[PDB]
Symmetry: C2
Subunit: 221 residues, 2 copies
């Protein structure tokens, strides 16, 4: 350093880079909170799907139970009930195995990053301390070479250790932030495609039940 | 009566008719229990529909909230959410106003019938008692005309009062039992037709969401 003020300029640059990094961390926290909220709501949706499945089944069971042997369509009602339950079961399971699983694995990458952010902060405090200490030693009236040399080693090491954590996270945080859209797109492509298909397939069975009831009605006219 | 054994033969016929009536009452009880069970399950189904509606809405709300201004399709996502909620709202309400209301009114006819069945039983005990009493008076060693005449009036009245309740319920119970099928047919025609239509209409919106997500995905490719 010396009269080129190298370490002082280093500190200024480090501070500007750290301000940018704290902006990344704010986005990272927002991204985690958004993901966890989506997880809660997707889980809520799955539980509502299952509730629908079960309530629908009981309803068709109760119809099959009031049926008389002579009534048209008893076996068709049973089959409608069975096929509908399979549709619900598969729809729920495919949502679990796609959108939910993918979201859980996406969220699974956050705790390790949070731990390395924590380590980076601590290592920055050590690096900051070593830089200031070296600056002080280099500007003193007494010039103690053995003392300065050791402070140089300590500064070089603290810097290396900090920058290891820093350069990785400087890459990883904005990249993870960028992947946000692809993650939401794929989650909702999965939800919407499975649901579209489910609604189309179950309509066929609703129509079959209507048809059976029409014929039962006609039989008893 | 006298030596033609009129009152004794009357009692035999009354007993055979009463055995048939008790068979009607068993069916009536079964019919009420079937209806109440169907009411419970239909209510359960409606509550599951509402749960689905609400859980679906939160899910789309959370998507709209993560959206960035530059992202394709923000207004389309909002509109999908709004239109889906209207579909759910109307589907639930039409089920309330048709199948549920109709079932509630159908079940509403049972308590008055149960009360008249109760009255009939009591009036049958009085009628039974008056018939036996008249039989006893008519066969006695002492023939007391003023006594017999009064017992005749009491028998005639108790019979009239019983038969008022009896002939109505003898008509109403099998008729109500016969209406069972039409009631189940109309309940499930309503449920299945509304659901078929709902599933068809909401599939369109699921496809719209998939389309928007596809274009959002493409935009960020």
């Amino acid at each position: 350093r010396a009269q080129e003020k190298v370490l002082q300029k280093l500190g200024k640059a480090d501070e500007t880079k750290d301000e940018q990094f704290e902006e990344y961390v704010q986005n990272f926290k927002r991204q985690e909170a958004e993901g966890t909220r989506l997880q809660r709501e997707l889980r809520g949706y799955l539980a509502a799907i299952k509730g629908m499945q079960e309530a629908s089944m009981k309803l068709t069971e109760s119809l099959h139970e009031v049926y008389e042997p002579d009534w048209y369509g008893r076996e068709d009602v049973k089959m409608v009930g069975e096929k509908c339950d399979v549709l619900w079961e598969d729809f729920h399971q495919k949502l679990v195995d796609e959108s939910l699983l993918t979201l859980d694995t996406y969220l699974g990458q956050f705790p390790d990053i949070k731990n390395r952010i924590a380590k980076r902060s601590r290592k920055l405090v050590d690096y900051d301390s070593a830089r200031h200490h070296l600056e002080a030693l280099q500007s003193s009236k007494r010039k103690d070479e053995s003392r300065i040399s050791k402070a140089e080693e300590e500064f070089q090491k603290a810097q290396k250790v900090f920058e290891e954590f820093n350069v990785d996270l400087q890459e990883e945080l904005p990249s993870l932030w960028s992947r946000r859209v692809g993650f939401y797109v794929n989650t909702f492509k999965n939800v919407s495609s499975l649901e579209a298909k489910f609604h189309k397939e179950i309509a066929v069975l609703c129509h079959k039940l209507y048809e059976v009831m029409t014929k039962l009605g006609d039989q008893h006219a």
